[PDB]
């Protein structure tokens, strides 16, 4: 509850004294990568999945972490013990590091952070969020080191884009999932190596019996659903009511979206029984 | 030379102490602006024009520098005379500042940085420099807060985009030009309200009585070009000898380019006389 302790560089920091100079490149340019998992019963979820996904970032950007992957998880471990605490959130960043020149990465700098469990986290409410869909369409100026984060809300809590008027293509912040009047669950295939909770999911969804197609997903796609899902750390499986004009069902969560809830939370639980 | 001092949220710091808590959400998420401009004779250049990029810059991003400009203003000329130069590169940044929750912008921090003058800055060689096209083409994955940055060289220090497999597209770096056989110059209008150093350039171009076409350059233009250039604030105007397998010229700096470099020097003589 109280959080004592963050970890910088393999050290346990008083959250009181979590400092970086003002050189580091994530504050000077922005560049950097970060992970995000949940801790139930005192063990992060799909830890080695995370994990590898930290190390995948790292690599995309040329950074390379100070530590391999059974260092950084005995150090997770050991902040988790630190902070007395069994159910968490726990933050992962890398940042370019302090440099020299204000720009040569030089030596990264590793920051473990923790939070209480997110309140909404895995909330599974039976009424669907309402979203709108908006063009994938600053050009490219260097002043802005910043995920676009800065949508105006537009009655809404969140959105998909629409790219060349006829594609579906999923925001960063979470997987995007139709159910089809059949039965068959379409999802994208463009982030199929990045989400963890989206191949949980879809794992889940097969072992029920449920067929899954990956690829793209066209516009019209849309009026032709019975229910439609986002997937992320903090959502789980989250019921989608509404999108644009379009309400899904009666606005509630739909019969198989219910159904993948449910399997998710077994999916947690098959993982922390081998914990 | 020794920089002493820089500024955090309005107070001179030591260097040594400059530190930011890592609930900034420019560590978390690269959420941030920048600017950075030169100092001559005591005087940032230019300096209306930089601190109008950076209030935009932020407006962008929904972010409340927490001065108004003739503070900033003062802010600059103390830490100046505070550190004792009159040459220099200064470096604004405003972050999204400190959020209780990691994710809520409540309070930008704003920072000013002050280094020597750049060794290399307004170097004006002879020899152009060497770059290659690319495409315009992570397919946006929220773990990655990272303008860039990842080229790998590749014989070249620089480049510039193709997008389509037709249209030259500019980096955020630098703005790009080139002059053809009958002396028109021709850049890119996309960074028209963005670029200072752009500006002045294309200014004492048609002052010079140059015409100064500003549209979308398509890809076959390379081939009739009899110059390129890069204008932006730290290289003034930096002449390019040579794009892929393309020699200008014999690779050294063109007849207008080098005009280009005198009238620029000119721009900054007139500049620093109204100061
Ligand atoms: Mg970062
Ligand atoms: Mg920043």
Same mark, same amino acid.
């Given at each position: 509850?109280?959080?004592?302790?963050?970890?910088?560089?393999?050290?346990?920091?008083?959250?009181?004294?979590?400092?970086?100079?003002?050189?580091?490149?994530?504050?000077?340019?922005?560049?950097?990568?970060?992970?995000?998992?949940?801790?139930?019963?005192?063990?992060?979820?799909?830890?080695?999945?995370?994990?590898?996904?930290?190390?995948?970032?790292?690599?995309?950007?040329?950074? +390379?972490?100070?530590?391999?992957?059974?260092?950084? /998880?005995?150090? $997770?471990? &050991?902040?988790?013990? %630190?902070?007395?605490?069994? *159910?968490?959130?726990?933050?992962?960043?890398?940042?370019?590091?302090?440099?020299?020149?204000?720009?040569?990465?030089?030596?990264?700098?590793?920051?473990?952070?923790?939070?209480?469990?997110?309140?909404?986290?895995?909330?599974?409410?039976?009424?669907?969020?309402?979203?709108?869909?908006?063009?994938?369409?600053?050009?490219?100026?260097?002043?802005?080191?910043?995920?676009?984060?800065?949508?105006?809300?537009?009655?809404?809590?969140?959105?998909?884009?629409?790219?060349?008027?006829?594609?579906?293509?999923?925001?960063?912040?979470?997987?995007?999932?139709?159910?089809?009047?059949?039965?068959?669950?379409?999802?994208?295939? +463009?982030?199929?190596?990045?989400?963890?909770?989206? /191949?949980?999911? $879809?794992? &889940?969804?097969?072992? %029920?019996?449920?067929?899954? *197609?990956?690829?793209?997903?066209?516009?019209?796609?849309?009026?032709?659903?019975?229910?439609?899902?986002?997937?992320?750390?903090?959502?789980?499986?989250?019921?989608?009511?509404?999108?644009?004009?379009?309400?899904?069902?009666?606005?509630?969560?739909?019969?198989?979206?219910?159904?993948?809830?449910?399997?998710?939370?077994?999916?947690?639980?098959?993982?922390?029984?081998?914990?």
């Amino acid at each position: 509850h109280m959080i004592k302790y963050y970890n910088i560089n393999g050290q346990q920091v008083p959250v009181e004294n979590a400092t970086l100079h003002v050189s580091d490149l994530s504050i000077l340019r922005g560049y950097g990568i970060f992970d995000y998992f949940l801790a139930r019963e005192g063990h992060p979820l799909f830890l080695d999945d995370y994990l590898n996904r930290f190390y995948r970032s790292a690599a995309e950007l040329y950074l +390379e972490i100070p530590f391999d992957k059974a260092e950084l /998880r005995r150090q $997770i471990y &050991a902040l988790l013990q %630190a902070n007395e605490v069994r *159910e968490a959130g726990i933050r992962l960043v890398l940042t370019g590091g302090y440099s020299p020149d204000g720009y040569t990465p030089v030596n990264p700098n590793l920051l473990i952070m923790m939070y209480d469990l997110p309140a909404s986290a895995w909330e599974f409410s039976a009424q669907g969020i309402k979203i709108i869909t908006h063009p994938f369409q600053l050009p490219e100026v260097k002043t802005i080191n910043y995920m676009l984060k800065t949508i105006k809300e537009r009655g809404a809590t969140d959105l998909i884009y629409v790219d060349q008027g006829e594609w579906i293509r999923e925001s960063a912040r979470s997987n995007f999932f139709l159910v089809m009047p059949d039965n068959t669950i379409v999802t994208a295939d +463009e982030k199929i190596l990045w989400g963890i909770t989206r /191949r949980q999911v $879809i794992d &889940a969804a097969r072992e %029920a019996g449920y067929a899954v *197609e990956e690829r793209r997903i066209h516009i019209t796609e849309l009026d032709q659903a019975r229910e439609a899902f986002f997937t992320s750390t903090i959502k789980g499986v989250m019921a989608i009511g509404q999108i644009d004009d379009r309400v899904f069902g009666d606005g509630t969560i739909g019969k198989v979206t219910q159904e993948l809830q449910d399997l998710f939370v077994g999916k947690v639980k098959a993982y922390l029984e081998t914990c």
